[PDB]
Amino acid sequence: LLDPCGYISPESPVVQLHSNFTAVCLKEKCMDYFHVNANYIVWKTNHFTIPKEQYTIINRTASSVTFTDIASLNIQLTCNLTFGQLQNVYGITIISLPPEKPKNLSCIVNEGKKMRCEWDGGRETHLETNFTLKSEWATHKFADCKAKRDTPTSCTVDYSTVYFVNIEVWVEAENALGKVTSDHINFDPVYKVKPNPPHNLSVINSEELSSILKLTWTNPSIKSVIILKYNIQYRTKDASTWSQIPPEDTASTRSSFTVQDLKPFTEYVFRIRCMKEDGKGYWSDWSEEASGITYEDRPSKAPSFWYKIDPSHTQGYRTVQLVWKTLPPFEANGKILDYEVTLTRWKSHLQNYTVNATKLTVNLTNDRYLATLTVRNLVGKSDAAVLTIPACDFQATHPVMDLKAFPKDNMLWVEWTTPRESVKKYILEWCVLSDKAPCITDWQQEDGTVHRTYLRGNLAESKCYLITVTPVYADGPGSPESIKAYLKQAPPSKGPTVRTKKVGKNEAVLEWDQLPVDVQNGFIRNYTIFYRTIIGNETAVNVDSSHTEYTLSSLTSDTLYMVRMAAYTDEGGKDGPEFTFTTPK
Ligand SMILES: *[C@@H]1O[C@H](CO)[C@@H](O[C@@H]2O[C@H](CO)[C@@H](O[C@@H]3O[C@H](CO)[C@@H](O[C@@H]4O[C@H](CO)[C@@H](O)[C@H](O)[C@@H]4O)[C@H](O)[C@@H]3O)[C@H](O)[C@H]2NC(C)=O)[C@H](O)[C@H]1NC(C)=O
Ligand SMILES: *[C@H]1O[C@H](CO)[C@@H](O[C@@H]2O[C@H](CO)[C@@H](O[C@@H]3O[C@H](CO)[C@@H](O[C@@H]4O[C@H](CO)[C@@H](O)[C@H](O)[C@@H]4O)[C@H](O)[C@@H]3O)[C@H](O)[C@H]2NC(C)=O)[C@H](O)[C@H]1NC(C)=O
Ligand SMILES: *[C@@H]1O[C@H](CO)[C@@H](O[C@@H]2O[C@H](CO)[C@@H](O[C@@H]3O[C@H](CO)[C@@H](O)[C@H](O)[C@@H]3O)[C@H](O)[C@H]2NC(C)=O)[C@H](O)[C@H]1NC(C)=O
Ligand SMILES: *[C@@H]1O[C@H](CO)[C@@H](O[C@@H]2O[C@H](CO)[C@@H](O)[C@H](O)[C@H]2NC(C)=O)[C@H](O)[C@H]1NC(C)=O
Ligand SMILES: *[C@H]1O[C@H](CO)[C@@H](O[C@@H]2O[C@H](CO)[C@@H](O)[C@H](O)[C@H]2NC(C)=O)[C@H](O)[C@H]1NC(C)=O
Ligand SMILES: *[C@H]1O[C@H](CO)[C@@H](O[C@@H]2O[C@H](CO)[C@@H](O)[C@H](O)[C@H]2NC(C)=O)[C@H](O)[C@H]1NC(C)=O
Numbered sequence: 001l002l003d004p005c006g007y008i009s010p011e012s013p014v015v016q017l018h019s020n021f022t023a024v025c026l027k028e029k030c031m032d033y034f035h036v037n038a039n040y041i042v043w044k045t046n047h048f049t050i051p052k053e054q055y056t057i058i059n060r061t062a063s064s065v066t067f068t069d070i071a072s073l074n075i076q077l078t079c080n081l082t083f084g085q086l087q088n089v090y091g092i093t094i095i096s097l098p099p100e101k102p103k104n105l106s107c108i109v110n111e112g113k114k115m116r117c118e119w120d121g122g123r124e125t126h127l128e129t130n131f132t133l134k135s136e137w138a139t140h141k142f143a144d145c146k147a148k149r150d151t152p153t154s155c156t157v158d159y160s161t162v163y164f165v166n167i168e169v170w171v172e173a174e175n176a177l178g179k180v181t182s183d184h185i186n187f188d189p190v191y192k193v194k195p196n197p198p199h200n201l202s203v204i205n206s207e208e209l210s211s212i213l214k215l216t217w218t219n220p221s222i223k224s225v226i227i228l229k230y231n232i233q234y235r236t237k238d239a240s241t242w243s244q245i246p247p248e249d250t251a252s253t254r255s256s257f258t259v260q261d262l263k264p265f266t267e268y269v270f271r272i273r274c275m276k277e278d279g280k281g282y283w284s285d286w287s288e289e290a291s292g293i294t295y296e297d298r299p300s301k302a303p304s305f306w307y308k309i310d311p312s313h314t315q316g317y318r319t320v321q322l323v324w325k326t327l328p329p330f331e332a333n334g335k336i337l338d339y340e341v342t343l344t345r346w347k348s349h350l351q352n353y354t355v356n357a358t359k360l361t362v363n364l365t366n367d368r369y370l371a372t373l374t375v376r377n378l379v380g381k382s383d384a385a386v387l388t389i390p391a392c393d394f395q396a397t398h399p400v401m402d403l404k405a406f407p408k409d410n411m412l413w414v415e416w417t418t419p420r421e422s423v424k425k426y427i428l429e430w431c432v433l434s435d436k437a438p439c440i441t442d443w444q445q446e447d448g449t450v451h452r453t454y455l456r457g458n459l460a461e462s463k464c465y466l467i468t469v470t471p472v473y474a475d476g477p478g479s480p481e482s483i484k485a486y487l488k489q490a491p492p493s494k495g496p497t498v499r500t501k502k503v504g505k506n507e508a509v510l511e512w513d514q515l516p517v518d519v520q521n522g523f524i525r526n527y528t529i530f531y532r533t534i535i536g537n538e539t540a541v542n543v544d545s546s547h548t549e550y551t552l553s554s555l556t557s558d559t560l561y562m563v564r565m566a567a568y569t570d571e572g573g574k575d576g577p578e579f580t581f582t583t584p585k
């Protein structure tokens with residue numbers, strides 16, 4: 001390496017994005033064998049140039065160029081023509097948003113690690129910059145955190161912290177154009193603890209009381225410097241929704257705690273996070289989660305019971321079909337072990353049974369009877385079911401009454417009036433009308449009381465249900481009542497086939513018959529029968545449904561007449577197959 005003809009000042013600068021650069025520039029002899037002076041030289045720059053009238057030749061050797069103010073990202077001026085013409089002398093590289101009181105600033109003493117402090121830089125400055133974390137005990141005073149380039153805001157001190165002992169922090173921020181500090185803060189670290197989270201967690205419940213399980217576990221290493229205050233969240237294996245638990249109900253350090261009033265025999269799954277008693281300091285992460293079932297606990301309420309009664313078999317004995325429904329794994333309170341019906345008759349004598357299915361189908365006589373189904377499990381023992389299956393002649397008597405049946409909202413409903421004195425359960429069966437589908441039925445039982453219910457199978461529309469409502473009083477079932485109702489209608493599918501009867505010299509009578517159940521897809525309100533001629537204006541009448549004929553009236557003598565008549569279900573109509581008659585002369 002040798003020499004560089006001429007220098008500026010210096011090789012590098014520093015752009016304080018609003019001020020003036022004092023540049024000055026060709027040594028004593030490089031100016032000799034090239035033959036110029038301060039003159040010959042320009043302050044060029046890869047477009048136009050530091051105008052002539054702009055420079056100020058310092059001495060028989062210089063060329064000061066000052067500056068506007070300043071205006072973009074980099075910036076590279078030139079003290080780069082050899083009098084005769086044709087200087088690449090030296091040039092530089094200035095730079096282009098100073099300091100910035102660091103903002104925000106918090107610290108956390110994350111249990112386990114050392115104190116840790118965050119903040120916020122501000123706005124993209126653009127002159128690399130150095131954050132430093134401070135501190136002092138006024139007893140003494142501490143080393144300095146100095147951010148990591150690859151995370152220029154975080155920071156961890158590097159002394160173990162010392163709860164109870166106000167402490168002193170503030171971020172000192174630096175870059176090229178003037179250093180500053182932040183806004184001081186003063187704490188007692190024991191207020192920025194974030195505890196590990198509780199752990200080694202367990203659920204139990206084999207105390208054998210079916211409303212509760214009870215969790216328990218392990219407080220965090222910090223148990224012993226601060227006073228824990230928790231939140232046991234917990235939910236049902238397969239909810240999406242975490243229930244919490246009253247936080248005055250979990251207030252200070254502890255290692256156990258029983259939650260209660262849970263569904264019996266279910267799966268539950270709990271989890272907790274705790275932090276320092278009052279609330280002054282970050283809470284911690286949730287401990288793994290833990291499971292647990294609940295007691296079992298007797299089956300709570302009746303199974304559903306009824307019998308059906310085939311037209312006796314071997315003249316005397318009368319077979320009798322008992323059948324009952326299954327408790328929803330929730331009236332069950334645990335696996336169903338096996339049903340049990342006992343049977344009692346004529347003053348004094350009776351055998352029981354233990355069916356493990358649901359149709360007990362027994363033998364039986366012509367006395368009055370009375371049956372009793374219960375349902376047992378790994379604990380009990382199931383509240384009594386109860387029928388009266390009678391002496392062979394017990395008739396009707398008292399039926400329900402004022403019974404409607406209808407739909408909405410996409411749910412079929414039957415409601416009637418609460419009969420006479422006091423029925424001890426209704427038990428309404430029902431099924432679907434259609435030629436080409438015997439009658440298969442459904443049934444539900446219904447607590448005595450009630451008088452409106454939404455039947456519950458899987459039924460269909462355009463399809464038409466028959467619904468019977470039998471009430472059960474003391475000593476048997478009552479004269480039952482029955483009603484039809486589709487659940488949602490379509491407009492018939494087919495449509496009536498017309499046809500005349502007779503025909504005057506103007507005015508003839510007409511004839512149909514019924515859109516047959518399975519094609520109606522609904523309660524046929526009414527018939528519109530409309531008719532035109534060849535010149536074919538048309539017109540029409542509508543007809544009060546019940547009607548099967550008519551009497552198209554004042555027509556022409558010697559006319560071509562064409563018809564076609566639609567039938568309509570609330571839902572709407574569908575005209576039949578046009579048919580064409582014609583008066584005499
Ligand atoms: C011959 O029979 C057919 C069979 O329906 C009649 O045509 C249908 O008639 C119903 C009612 O007459 C009607 O559709 C109604 O829509 C209403 C609402 O948009 C429903 O009203 C609701 O419930 C109450 C019933 O009025 C009402 O008070 C309440 O405010 C609410 O609006 C109403 O129940 C029906 O759903 C149409 O006019 C027609 N429906 C269809 C699908 O065609 C026809 O009216 C009969 N013709 C004669 C001349 O009697
Ligand atoms: C924070 O950030 C600023 C801005 O980037 C940093 O400025 C740096 O200052 C540090 C020391 O505070 C410095 O470490 C130097 O490395 C030099 C380059 O190699 C060293 O040179 C060494 O001795 C001679 C001097 O350059 C040289 O002959 C030899 O080659 C040898 O390497 C220098 O002496 C320091 O040891 C950085 O270089 C400098 N730049 C960078 C990118 O870090 C600084 O790190 C921080 N300053 C403060 C006040 O917090
Ligand atoms: C008649 O009564 C029995 C027992 O007295 C009842 O059996 C119960 O229902 C079935 C029996 O096979 C079981 O369902 C479950 O199957 C799954 C899947 O394989 C299995 O993982 C479950 O643990 C259980 O086996 C149920 O647990 C079973 N046992 C009992 C005590 O109820 C049922 O009402 C009738 N029996 C049968 C064989 O269906
Ligand atoms: C409490 O449980 C933690 C996590 O639930 C356990 O972590 C174990 O590390 C220990 C030593 O502490 C080993 O004996 C085990 O192999 C680890 N896991 C398990 C599931 O046993 C540990 O059992 C407990 N930790 C403390 C600090 O008491
Ligand atoms: C550059 O900036 C200051 C700011 O844009 C300007 O104000 C004065 O300018 C004249 C020469 O142009 C000088 O008399 C002064 O030196 C300037 N400041 C003062 C206090 O007089 C000026 O153009 C340049 N700057 C400075 C302060 O020297
Ligand atoms: C004449 O003027 C300039 C601007 O006053 C002088 O600036 C100096 O930079 C020089 C190198 O040229 C240093 O030796 C000095 O310390 C600065 N000031 C002075 C008074 O010397 C420079 O000396 C002169 N330039 C030339 C080419 O002779």
Ligand SMILES: *[C@@H]1O[C@H](CO[C@@H]2O[C@@H](C)[C@@H](O)[C@@H](O)[C@@H]2O)[C@@H](O)[C@H](O)[C@H]1NC(C)=O
Nearest residue numbers: 339340341342343350351352353354374376
């Ligand atoms: C079925 O029938 C039993 C009647 O036989 C016996 O009755 C008395 C004397 C007790 O010894 C009884 O335990 C015997 O079984 C009922 O007692 C028995 O509990 C019945 N099963 C059920 C579920 O009731």
